């Protein structure tokens, strides 16, 4: 099958906000559900994806040279749902003439560059139904009978990133799959020299143009992003003096041990979801080291080894080209001085220390997943009376007042539901299976008519 | 699609001798070629497989506990030809409800027990076209016009392993895929206590019945089979005294390094085949350590570690429970004595040493691949005049005198062609791709009519 | 030098309670301080060690086959203080004729069996100054002038483990290095079938005598001890049905990552000690995963793999020979029934489940380090007024009222000071350096006279 | 003890030619034999070492960034002889304040930079007895009674590398420990752009000065040196186009498997030496993959991975920045052209291909160990009549006619005796033990007088 485009003016069955991996997994699952080769029961649903980037890209600001996936390739966008799918990583390799060559690597962990290209190869097959350069700015409730008190569609308004014009599309069902936004410490001032990890590859080279210059560059944080940037900077700027600032005492290893890791299994979502709010909070805390503020062991070991080599060359740590400053917090940033370097004031992170002069501060402090709140502000009144937070059901559809919203209309959330669905929610871990679940939840009636 | 059985009395399009992995890969490729889901161009060919075992089994005498595949699961019976195939290892796992669980192991190397079950799961889907308990004993030339000098079919005669009756099936094309036979040193006498590695799991427990008894058991050889048996015996018979006898100075590691390993790539068969006899002989020798008389490093290290632990317990090697005797050869076996133990006489393997008294000698000396010669003795006269060896073309069809044999008739060899096709010939390495190549070579005309 | 014995009746310079690794490291450091070859400045101090075991043994109840050290051999009993010492692991190997052979293993982690033998080899060299089979039962204050209010020696009373007779030795200085006692859940009743991990190898075989019998054996806990026992039982009793009961959701991996692991460095003791009580408590919690309720990754992976193999054989987890039951707690133990099996009642560990019938319950719930409290009850009054807990100084000497105790008398604690000295206190990590520090603290005046 | 210098004019007991690791191990063993702390039996022997380098350096032309030892640190210059020695790698680390830090790396394989510094630290302690900048040019026989026919000393003549003046020293005993000389293919012409691997770090940067320039650089060979240079060039010159030319089909992995590796054990020298010439030749061939024309697996895998990444970026191998050209041999080098690039003509190495234009050719073709022949030309007549090759005894002393040479005079060879003493001869493997053996062989009489 081949998904054809729907004219902008027609009522859509589904409109998806964002075309990152989460939305792409839904597109793939729909294709597969409509394929007679895979689904024996298999008109076309009217679907559109809106993506603010001008083309498909996966965390392009963090495509650090040599960076690797932290998940088995088997957990791609189709395999766990159907290994026979044309959208598996192995079939992508076969199509590229690279399958035997990848096999000879004996690794489950492709370069992030390669995995992005896999997803790009998948994404390109849906170009007819994806509108790029469209930033969704609001979702507005709609009534086919404006005199009634029942909402039965939604209008999704997006802004063209190049022209700035506003387009509207109407749909019975909306999916919001917009990932996360850069989290910045509230104490830090705004400055072109202060840059979030998410914009590392895309904006730092424009600030620090000469790769041979002895720049002083600090990195704030101790998670995977902070470690990757710290390590890369030492290769990208060979004569630089880099400094890793962390409030913890040390970089800590990610837990990928097999029993613990079973929390990422697709079948575990049912189990997690059915737990109480207290139990879910308890569970997420207990398993935090699988995902948050943690670094892959291999990378920790490499950075440690690099530090040891500095010790061999010079026993005085204060003279090392690259340094780590643990149990520190930034208390003041001077950035109005005549020189191109900022002055960073540090204290102990325990409940006055040194001063650093730097050309740039990379801030690897993670992400927030609350941007859907702003997009859904105008539909908040459709929630049950007195409810001031969106409550996703197991099938990811948000709860709305049944007396206010028709059964045929709804809004689903994707990627922002860790609190209710578990640690796998924001990752690639369950995307293949979740895509299949989403297609059933959204298009079930049509698929049942064929079944 | 589903391959239906052909009545014994009808002329077959293809008859395959053996239903091990090589024949199974052909069955799978044919299924896939006939599947409209995978091949858009896709009556049924008349096909039968004859297998001497009573059911599908893969080296059952060597299904040693804990034994592992020495090849990536990606090199299964379909993936390298088509990752979308229902016969991939990953789809097998999915069907069994085990895919996520295998993923969590982070290994490319399943237990041999698991891989056999994968192949058994594949094999069971062809039960309608496989006759088990049928040992093929001869291939006889046939002439549709007996007064002419042109052969245009073959009669394949098989012996029922239970009843002993002789059945005949006629076919235009024959494939011989019968693997290897046990290679035994010519100096060794016949004795129930002298057993080839291929019969280890199936016959040794019948000889040495009490698992707690202090048996003396020797193992001859230094390849993967010898190492696996040596290591297993120490677990199976905890109180036994085992001795590894080898003519080499040491167990040597298998070469699985990535550049060298590319010799096993499916596309390399073309390159190898087109080389001269001298070059091919040279090439096979240079790369011998990838496959022959070699042990997986991990297993060498485990055995070595076990030996070290014996040293900790006792510094006198002569007192060790389990011993390795390198650079030795057996010169005499006494096995007519009144006691249940044989007397093995050893000398240096260099161009008189000790004596061992043992309850059993496991002989792990490898395999010969010449059994097709006996089966094809009655068709030898169809080869070009003066040719006293079978010459497989690139497509595995043996050369026959075109003035004696019709273009529609032929015999293909599988698994015994290392001399012409390379080190991957006897392994699982190229089976998926080779199956596809075989289906084209044998059924091409029919498939072209559909294409 | 060679430490000669002191007659029981003479006033000792030092008496050490316990001859485990901590006391042995002090003996070694004293030898080394007195050796002219190592210390250029170098009468004999009057010293005695009292050990309740009949000979040197290191956690003999947990010398599980195949069990390994969780610390580099470089952190032996001398190397970190002086690599030239005759008491290094490498010199032990050299003396045994095993150095080259160990080198060829390429491991930093010897078998626990080997490391015990290293320590036994060290211990045997101090046989003249160690009294075995002597259980210290009390430390009594002594006054050379009984009419005065100043304590200037201590009497250490011990009970002969064979004869039961009481011996007394007088000393100016005492070291208490008695390790830990078995920690048992308070809810469990006393029963010969309920056995702590510390008595696994020494007492379980006496209870379950027939190694081939299909016993049901449970294990309580999820730390290294629980994992080792769980794994071993499956080898020791091949036909048994084992069950691992844990309150956590999963076995979690030990953190041995290099930055975090620096907390075990000898120089870090100064840093840890100088922190506030609050900071120390915070620090110990943050780094808990380096030592407590954690399993070596390799062992987790092996157990996981064994579980997967059960899945291959049978997809129904309830039928598996060996099982893990996570998030469970024991609420009732029935052990008065006519059968030889106890009935264990389980519930969820979250704030009624199944029932198990077992022949034995192995309880791997860790250790307490409070036994010094009982031994020092009669000297408690020498602490500063109102102080109801022993307060070790940096040099491990407990604080006593200077107006009550002479400067030449004192009591040191070893191995029970994690709260004040850090996570390395109970381990082998800092023993070499700590031994040297202890010798200076205790014998400094004599050593200064030579210096 | 401290070895004092001998005036140039005095008769020496020993003169050693070369102060690389082999001579340094002798110096260390002598120190240790004379140390009362280690040898209880312990005037000073008159000794001098002559070294052509201006200071101690270990293969400085191949101190490639990130390069690692291929041998356990335990096989340092003392440990296998005496772990108590002050000259062990661990004691070096302790002295540098780095022991705990190295321990935390969990590696047996220090950087070559670190190991050189270890050896430099050892070497500096013998500065009084080492004359640097002295290139030995000949050994001349000497007779204390010139009218007699008996040689009883040797004169060693050396050339000052700075002034060019000739100095002579007289000695009863000589050791030649001069390592190897650069082996170059005889077909290659002399050119500043054609450089042996041994001069990579020291001379290539002087030829290719701009690290950012898009140079074309070829590497000839497929051993460890060729792989290290190939890999490093890609980092040193990021915009370069590198090409690895090899006559073999692939880089092959070094055999470091534990049983095979036992050939490097010090005790194995006795066993190897006592074999016949035929057996020794056979043995060296069988074990070639442990040392010659082989690459460490880890490095092969890294290079392979780098090649795969090029494939991801571009499926056309001809466009890759860095390429490997297997089964090739150089037949013509054009190097008289007006451009700065040479033209290299390649053919198949099998019994016309492409053309490469390159700025430099690195030639990693190994070493010869025959330079002692030139130095000993004037003493050849002292060998038994008709003997045209030097024959080292087990103790490394060359055979001389007893009627021509006094028992108190002799010449020993070190590092060039693989044919007679085995594969460990040229390596660090047996240096500690061999040093001890050499001290006994040379100074035994003096040491026996003390014993
Ligand atoms: C550097 C990095 C590496 C990672 N690597 C891994 C890994 O190895 N394995 C793993 O499982 N997880 C990984 N993750 C986790 C990651 O969250 C998932 O891989 C994945 O990106 C989640 O997909 P998503 O579609 O939910 O969110 P995203 O990938 O963020 O996609 C959301 C999309 O919505 C678009 N969008 C946002 N706002 C709007 C708007 N208003 N209108 C229109 N479009 C909009 C964005 O442009 C984006 O394309 C990584 C995360 C980071 C930051
Ligand atoms: C113990 C062991 C482990 C191995 N593991 C691996 C591995 O991990 N990876 C890998 O790539 N290679 C491995 N191999 C190599 C092995 O040769 C292939 O895996 C595979 O078995 C080859 O398949 P085949 O069909 O050519 O031969 P076989 O597997 O031997 O199958 C031939 C079949 O023909 C039947 N047969 C024989 N004679 C007759 C007759 N006269 N009439 C009818 N039927 C007959 C036999 O019963 C058998 O079923 C292993 C080999 C051994 C011995
Ligand atoms: C199974 C196990 C394995 C371990 N493995 C490691 C490892 O790999 N690495 C590591 O660093 N740590 C390990 N540890 C931590 C362990 O605590 C230390 O290795 C070490 O045992 C501490 O030595 P110690 O002398 O302080 O205590 P102990 O080893 O317990 O020694 C105390 C001694 O005092 C004796 N004693 C007790 N009471 C009396 C009395 N009243 N009178 C006389 N004598 C008495 C005891 O018999 C004992 O010999 C392990 C612990 C366990 C339980
Ligand atoms: C790049 C490289 C890396 C290696 N790494 C390892 C390793 O990891 N492990 C290992 O076991 N082996 C290794 N080797 C093997 C190596 O041969 C030994 O490590 C070691 O160098 C042998 O020591 P030697 O003293 O015999 O020879 P050399 O190290 O070559 O020392 C000989 C010395 O004699 C001097 N000399 C030469 N001619 C004269 C003269 N006419 N007069 C005066 N002085 C002279 C030289 O300047 C030199 O200092 C490596 C070899 C190379 C090339
Ligand atoms: N940060 C990525 C975590 C991936 C997870 N361990 C999984 O297997 O799904
Ligand atoms: N449980 C033993 C921990 C040992 C510690 N990682 C150390 O290196 O000292
Ligand atoms: N090329 C160095 C080889 C070192 C050798 N495997 C050894 O252990 O001595």
Separation between Cα atoms, residue A339 and residue B15, nearest integer Å? 85
**Do D192 and D219 touch, CB atoms closer than 8 A?**
no
> Angle at the Cα of B49 (from B48 to B51), degrees rounded to 5?
145
Contact A312 D98 (CB under 8 A): yes
Cα atoms in the 13 Å half-sphere on the side-chain side of D328? 23
Name residues whose C-beta falls within 8 Å of residue C352's C-beta, 6 or more positions apart in sequence: none
Separation between Cα atoms, residue B379 and residue B151, nearest integer Å? 10
Distance from CA of C292 to the nearest CA of A (A): 15
In chain D, the N- to C-terminal Cα span, in Å, equals 17
Separation between Cα atoms, residue C431 and residue D20, nearest integer Å? 38
Number of inter-chain CB pairs under 8 A, A vs B: 73
**Resolution expressed in Å:** 1.9
Experimental method: X-ray
Distance from CA of C216 to the nearest CA of D (A): 40
Cβ atoms within 10 A of the Cβ of B5, count? 13
Name residues whose C-beta falls within 8 Å of residue A141's C-beta, 6 or more positions apart in sequence: A151, A154, A155, A378, A379, A382
Best probe of the D interface among B224, B253, B256, B259, by most D CBs < 10 A, is: B259
For chain D, the C-alpha Rg in angstroms (whole number) is: 24
Separation between Cα atoms, residue C48 and residue D11, nearest integer Å? 56
Surface-to-core class of residue C448, CB atoms within 10 Å of its CB (0-12 exposed, 13-18 middle, 19+ buried): exposed
Render A346-379 in DSSP notation, one character per residue. Answer: EEES-----EEEESEEEE---EE--THHHHTGGG
Looking at chain A, the residues that come just before a C–N gap of over 2.5 A are: 42, 351
Give the position of tokens 């539909």. A379
What residues of chain D lie within 8 A of the CB of A306, using their CB? none
Name residues whose C-beta falls within 8 Å of residue B329's C-beta, 6 or more positions apart in sequence: B247, B346, B347, B348, B349
Pairing of the two strands D181-182 and B342-348:
unpaired
> Cα A45 to chain center, whole Å?
27
In chain C, the N- to C-terminal Cα span, in Å, equals 17
Sorted by where each starts, the structural domains of chain A and their CATH numbers stand as 1-451 (3.50.50.60)
Residue C49: name the closest of C177, C162, C179 by CA.
Answer: C177
The reply to whether ligand 1 has any atom less than 6 angstroms from the CB of A59 is yes
Ligand nearest to the CA of C429: 6
Separation between Cα atoms, residue C415 and residue B314, nearest integer Å? 33
Separation between Cα atoms, residue B50 and residue B157, nearest integer Å? 10
Surface-to-core class of residue B199, CB atoms within 10 Å of its CB (0-12 exposed, 13-18 middle, 19+ buried): middle
Tokens coding C145: 């002038």
Surface-to-core class of residue B161, CB atoms within 10 Å of its CB (0-12 exposed, 13-18 middle, 19+ buried): middle
Name residues whose C-beta falls within 8 Å of residue C107's C-beta, 6 or more positions apart in sequence: none
Mutational test site, ligand 2, from B21, B107, B157, max ligand atoms within 8 Å of CB: B21
Residue D137: name the closest of D397, D415, D374 by CA.
Answer: D374
Separation between Cα atoms, residue A119 and residue A142, nearest integer Å? 34
The helix (H) or strand (E) run that includes residue D435 is: helix D431-450
- From the list B97, B111, B311, the residue facing C309 with the nearest CB is B111
Separation between Cα atoms, residue C172 and residue C141, nearest integer Å? 10
Strand, helix or coil for residue B111: strand
Render C172-233 in DSSP notation, one character per residue. Answer: EEEEE----EE---TTSPP-TTEEEGGGHHHHHHHHS--TTS--EEEEE--SHHHHHHHHHH
What residues of chain C lie within 8 A of the CB of B304, using their CB? 104-105
- How far apart, in Å, are the Cα atoms of D419 and each of A151, D278, D291, D366, D383? 92, 10, 14, 17, 19
The reply to whether ligand 3 has any atom less than 6 angstroms from the CB of C423 is no
Atom of ligand 5 nearest to the CA of A424: 9
Quickly list H helices, B50-182: 89-96, 99-103, 112-123
Q: How far is the CA of C71 from the centre of ligand 6 (A)?
A: 5
* Beta-bridge partner residues of A333: A344
Cβ atoms within 10 A of the Cβ of B87, count? 27
In degrees rounded to 5, what are phi and psi of residue B125? -75, -10
Cβ atoms within 10 A of the Cβ of C170, count? 17
Name residues whose C-beta falls within 8 Å of residue D224's C-beta, 6 or more positions apart in sequence: D70, D254, D294, D295, D296, D299
Render B311-354 in DSSP notation, one character per residue. Answer: HHH-S-GGG-SSEEE-SEEEEEEE--SSSS-EEEEEEES-----
Separation between Cα atoms, residue B139 and residue B157, nearest integer Å? 6
Determine the residue of chain A that is closest to C222 in CA distance: A259
Distance from CA of A265 to the nearest CA of B (A): 7
**Do A425 and A417 touch, CB atoms closer than 8 A?**
yes
Q: Which residues of B touch A (CB under 8 A)?
A: 36-38, 72, 74-75, 79-80, 82-86, 88, 90-91, 93-94, 99-100, 103-106, 108, 258, 261-262, 265-267
In degrees rounded to 5, what are phi and psi of residue D331? -110, -25
**Do A363 and A379 touch, CB atoms closer than 8 A?**
no
Surface-to-core class of residue D90, CB atoms within 10 Å of its CB (0-12 exposed, 13-18 middle, 19+ buried): buried
Sign of the torsion formed by the C-alpha atoms of B98, B104, B109 and B112: negative
Contact D111 A315 (CB under 8 A): no
Cβ atoms within 10 A of the Cβ of A150, count? 13
Separation between Cα atoms, residue D276 and residue D261, nearest integer Å? 21
Atom of ligand 6 nearest to the CA of C428: 9
Torsion, CA A52, CA A57, CA A62, CA A65, rounded to 10:
-160
**Do C100 and C64 touch, CB atoms closer than 8 A?**
no
Give the position of tokens 């990208």. A236
Separation between Cα atoms, residue D389 and residue D385, nearest integer Å? 11
Best probe of the B interface among D247, D250, D284, by most B CBs < 10 A, is: D250
* Beta-bridge partner residues of B243: B218, B323
Mutational test site, ligand 2, from B15, B17, B18, B298, max ligand atoms within 8 Å of CB: B18
Separation between Cα atoms, residue B123 and residue B108, nearest integer Å? 22
């Amino acid at each position: 099958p081949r998904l054809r485009s729907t004219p902008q003016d027609e009522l859509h069955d589904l409109l998806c906000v964002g075309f990152g991996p989460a939305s792409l997994a839904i597109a793939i699952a729909l294709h597969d559900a409509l394929d007679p080769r895979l689904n024996k029961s298999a008109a076309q649903p009217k679907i559109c994806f809106l993506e603010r980037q001008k083309q498909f890209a996966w965390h392009s600001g963090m495509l650090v040279p040599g960076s690797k996936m932290q998940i088995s390739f088997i957990k791609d966008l189709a395999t766990l749902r159907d290994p026979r799918s044309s959208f598996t990583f192995l079939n992508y390799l076969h199509q590229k003439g690279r399958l035997i060559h990848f096999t000879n690597l004996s690794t489950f962990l492709p370069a992030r560059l390669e995995f992005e290209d896999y997803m790009r190869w998948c994404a390109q097959q849906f170009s007819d139904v994806v509108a790029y350069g469209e930033e969704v700015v609001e979702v507005i409730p709609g009534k086919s009978d404006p005199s009634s008190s029942v909402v039965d569609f939604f209008t999704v308004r997006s802004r063209n990133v190049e022209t700035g014009e506003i387009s509207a599309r109407r749909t019975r069902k909306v999916v919001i799959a917009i990932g996360g936004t850069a989290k910045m410490p509230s104490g830090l001032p705004q400055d072109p020299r202060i840059i979030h990890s998410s914009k590392y590859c895309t904006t730092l080279p424009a600030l620090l143009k000469d790769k041979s210059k002895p720049y002083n560059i600090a990195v704030l944080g101790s998670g995977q992003s902070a470690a990757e940037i710290f390590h890369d900077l030492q290769k990208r700027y060979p004569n630089s003096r880099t400094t890793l600032i962390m409030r913890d005492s040390a970089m800590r290893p990610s837990d990928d041990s097999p029993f613990v890791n079973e929390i990422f299994n697709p079948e575990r979502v049912d189990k997690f979801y059915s737990q109480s709010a207290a139990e879910r909070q308890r569970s997420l805390l207990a398993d935090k080291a699988t995902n948050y503020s943690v670094v892959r062991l291999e990378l920790i070991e490499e950075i440690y080894n690099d530090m040891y080599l500095q010790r061999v060359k010079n026993p005085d740590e204060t003279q090392w080209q690259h340094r780590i400053l643990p149990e520190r917090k930034i208390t003041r940033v001077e950035h109005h001085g005549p020189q191109s370097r900022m002055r960073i004031h540090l204290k102990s992170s325990k409940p006055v220390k040194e001063t650093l002069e730097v050309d740039a501060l990379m801030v690897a402090t993670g992400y927030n997943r609350n941007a859907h709140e702003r997009l859904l502000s105008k539909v908040q009144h459709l929630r049950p009376t007195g409810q001031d937070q969106w409550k996703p059901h197991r099938d990811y559809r948000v709860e709305m007042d049944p007396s206010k919203v028709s059964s045929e209309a709804g809004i689903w959330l994707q990627g922002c539901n860790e609190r209710t669905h578990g640690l796998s929610d924001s990752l690639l871990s369950v995307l293949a299976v979740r895509g299949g679940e989403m297609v059933q939840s959204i298009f079930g009636e049509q698929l049942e008519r064929a079944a």
